[PDB]
A and B are shown apart, each in its own frame.
Chain A
Amino acid sequence: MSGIALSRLAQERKAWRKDHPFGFVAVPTKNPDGTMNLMNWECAIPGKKGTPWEGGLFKLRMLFKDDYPSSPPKCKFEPPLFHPNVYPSGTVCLSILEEDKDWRPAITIKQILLGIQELLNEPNIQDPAQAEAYTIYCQNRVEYEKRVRAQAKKFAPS
């Protein structure tokens, strides 16, 4: 039922408002009527300090199902980013985002955002999602980091 999902989502929003990591943003998107959607969140992940991603505010969208929290949400970067584990559509290929492996219903939205943030600097070579991103990474590593730094400053908050 959605009742279980919406109750869990209500806990997530209240917990996020009272306490959340600095730089991060997580808020239910605004419906056309002016209201907001608890099953659709607009998120923003800050680049990790000391990394080529530092200085960037990368925006993604969380899509929850009625099966939540039994099923993980669909994390979708808008716009899509240059990253090996990010499909061209913008969808994130992360282990904790699949109910068939390494996904626990007790995982907080915060833990997901913090998980995706680490995936940025530390991509998984095991599951290539993007073609060119996986290519440049396993070849011209110097070129790869230049692409990331240019992308971070491109998505610099202002």
Chain B
Amino acid sequence: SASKPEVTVRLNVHKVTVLTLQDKIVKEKFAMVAPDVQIEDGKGTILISSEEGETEANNHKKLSEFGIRNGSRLQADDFLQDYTLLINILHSEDLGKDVEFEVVGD
């Protein structure tokens, strides 16, 4: 105790959105069903809520609009299972395809 599972994900904070962060990244890639993504800022700022109707207005906005920058720390907690994950943000604009993100991983 205590070594919480922690990964690093490269993406562009000005391109990817919260919905893409929710569906494509946290749920699809990291296998979550009802995740609660919190921004580790010492303020208890939660970006994504599992409860429908609460944070469905942030989906269209980009991550950068929430102060999310390079080296940001995100804590995703699944509501339907004891799954906590610390995701680090490595801001990279050069991806190629262009792809949305990449876990390093991998």
Contacts and interface: CB of A to CB of B under 8 A. Distances in A.
Contact of B45 (A5, A14, A36, A66): A36
Interface string B50-86: 0100110110010001110000000001010000000
B44 interface: yes
Interface string A18-50: 000000000110010111111100000000000
Contact of A34 (B42, B43, B58): B58
B21 interface: no
Given A2-B44, A6-B44, A17-B51, A35 B39 contact: yes
A3 to B, nearest CB: 8
B49 interface: yes
Nearest to B58: A34
A136 to B, nearest CB: 40
A10 interface: yes
Contacts of A2: 42-44
A28 B46 contact: yes
B47 interface: yes
Contacts of B54: 27, 36
A2 B73 CA distance: 15
Contacts of B55: 34-36
Q: Which 8 A-B pairs have the closest CB atoms?
A: A38-B44, A2-B42, A34-B58, A39-B44, A36-B46, A6-B44, A35-B45, A35-B47
Interface of A: 2, 5-6, 9-10, 14, 17, 27-28, 31, 33-39, 64, 66
8 contacts: A2-B44, A14-B79, A31-B45, A34-B57, A37-B43, A38-B44, A39-B43, A64-B44
